[PDB]
């Protein structure tokens, strides 16, 4: 029906506009020269790379990005392994009280950071150990594991373990058959859970901020939250906007690629 198809065509662009303009705004506010800073036009003029050149001029961002990625990978891997090791027992084993073990994790996933920050800073994790990566990786892992348990449990409810029964008639030895049959089906699940943990662990500001304060471990959200101008007497907003555009630039292209996996993992395969 051409009128209702037009109405849907309108609804589709409206929701795209709602999601994109507060992003394109940052790009435009960054690209606007300091003459067009304080000029109210959203449509830019005389756009310049000078602010982006000023981000990479001096080593201030290199360590923030490189530490964000390093912490992302290590907290992903340790969460994926122990979260998968839990998820196999949560799916395949049928032990008494198993609902408690899944129930408590989805609660501590939501726990209030401004509680945890006081005791940890006043412990051997801030007085003994302090700013080096373990002082973040240990709390990061804790908020990551529940998301690993949920998403990996959803993938292990999806795999038919009766494929193992078929495999145990395709010869017998599981140390060959299970190894060769099951891993190709496990892979798209585990890589999706790894992506979602990497992103979910990326942006917990209160712990990233409160436990670091060095050129090592001052991760990408903290770097921009301490940043307040590239220069002495330039209007700082264009430089801040450039920094925000730099920091976001990886994770947009990252989620842009893996969309089916991302929505399936959160939706437990429902879409």
């Amino acid at each position: 029906d051409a009128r209702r198809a037009t109405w849907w065509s309108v609804v589709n662009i409206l929701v795209i506009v709602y999601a994109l303009i507060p992003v394109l705004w940052i790009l435009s506010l960054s690209l606007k020269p300091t003459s067009s800073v304080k000029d109210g036009k959203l449509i830019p003029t005389e756009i310049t790379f000078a602010n982006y050149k000023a981000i990479f001029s001096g080593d201030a961002f290199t360590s923030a990005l490189f530490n964000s990625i390093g912490i992302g990978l290590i907290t992903t891997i340790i969460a994926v392994v122990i979260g998968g090791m839990a998820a196999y027992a949560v799916a395949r084993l049928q032990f008494p009280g198993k609902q408690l073990l899944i129930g408590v994790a989805l609660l501590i996933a939501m726990f209030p950071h401004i509680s945890l920050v006081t005791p940890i800073f006043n412990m051997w994790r801030g007085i003994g150990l302090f700013d080096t990566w373990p002082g973040l990786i240990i709390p990061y892992i804790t908020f990551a594991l529940p998301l690993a348990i949920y998403t990996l449990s959803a993938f292990f409810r999806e795999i038919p373990w009766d494929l193992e029964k078929a495999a145990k008639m395709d010869g017998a030895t599981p140390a060959q058959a299970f190894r060769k049959v099951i891993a190709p089906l496990a892979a798209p699940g585990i890589v999706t859970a790894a992506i979602l943990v990497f992103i979910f662990a990326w942006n917990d500001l209160l712990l990233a901020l409160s436990l670091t304060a060095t050129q090592r471990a001052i991760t990408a959200p903290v770097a921009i939250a301490n940043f307040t101008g590239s220069s002495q007497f330039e209007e700082p907003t264009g430089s801040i906007a450039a920094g925000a555009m730099v920091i976001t630039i990886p994770i947009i292209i990252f989620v842009l690629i893996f969309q089916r996996r991302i929505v399936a993992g959160l939706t437990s395969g429902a879409v």
Binding site: F121, G126, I127, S210, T214, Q215, S231, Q232
Partner: protein, 437 residues
Amino acid sequence: GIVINYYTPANEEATFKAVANRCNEQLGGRFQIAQRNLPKGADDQRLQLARRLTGNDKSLDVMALDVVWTAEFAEAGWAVPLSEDPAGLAEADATENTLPGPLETARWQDELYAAPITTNTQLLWYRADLMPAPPTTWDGMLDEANRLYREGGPSWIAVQGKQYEGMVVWFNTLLQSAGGQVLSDDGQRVTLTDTPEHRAATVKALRIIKSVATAPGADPSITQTDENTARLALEQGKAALEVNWPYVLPSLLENAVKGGVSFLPLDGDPALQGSINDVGTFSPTDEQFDIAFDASKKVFGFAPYPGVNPDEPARVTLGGLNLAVASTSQHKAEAFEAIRCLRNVENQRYTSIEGGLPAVRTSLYDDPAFQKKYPQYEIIRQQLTNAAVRPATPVYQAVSTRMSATLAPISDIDPERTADELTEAVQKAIDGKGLIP
């Protein structure tokens, strides 16, 4: 090879990078000097520093702190006192040739805990292209801005109005100027309303704040105008006036040479071609400074800080930076050689001449080349004869946040009940009770 982490607030980074480079070139192979930025804001500057000592960081060596806090660090046993050089030299170098006021900020109880490096008071900046003699009284200043508002001109006052320790500077200048003070001389008790003369002082100071906060044609965001906004408001041509610090000078000249401010087209003159540095700083030649300033002085300029009464020149509040050596650094004899050469008598020539901060080595204000290149020098010296300190006691910061938080909006205050409100909050902060917001 060892490197020394020199912490600085972010407002004077390019200056301390130039100073750091000089020192790093002068020192030879001993060790490197490297700068680090704390935030721009006058208590976040403390937050990110105390967090590096409450946790035992080894990446903290030399730190620039605000003249207001030092009693707290000293009483906490951080910021180890200047007696402890193997060279013995820092306690002499700190005493050697300073302005006397800043040096008296740097000792908690007889012993020095830091060495002064910069000091600053405030100047009343004004647009000579649209106004006559710089309004002396706050009342006359509001009168002149009212004229400009009715004429349709740059009506804003651009005061340091925000809920932070950098605003308590302003109020405490008004209270000191009106003849009151926050704490007793001994620091042991409140004194905001100790005598009915103090009641009159504080209530007048609050009326004056309320007046500037609410007069018709005021700047819309004046509850949230941080210090950095004031500089920008004048340079944007939106304010005919401000009461900023002594460093708005070069920032304007720089923002007139590198394209920028429409009322001063110095960017149009061949004399300034290549005058700005390839690191992005200004740093003109002597003739380029002189022509930039001689073009500016007809449009833009300064005066001593306005009075509460018609004829009582203000007890303007003392500000600055004191360098200290941290407790936690593993080596530290090397950090004392760093502080000595960071406050070197040549080194701080650049700190004023191009960095905008007033130097503390006394002779620089007598020297002719400095007195030429630093044209505001005589007003600063003058004010440092009568400039009021903030009350040195370790509770200061806990008081100053309580006082500011009681004046949460800068408008919207009943002066009389707010005077009691200030006394109550300040009392509780000396008592150390309750929660800071």
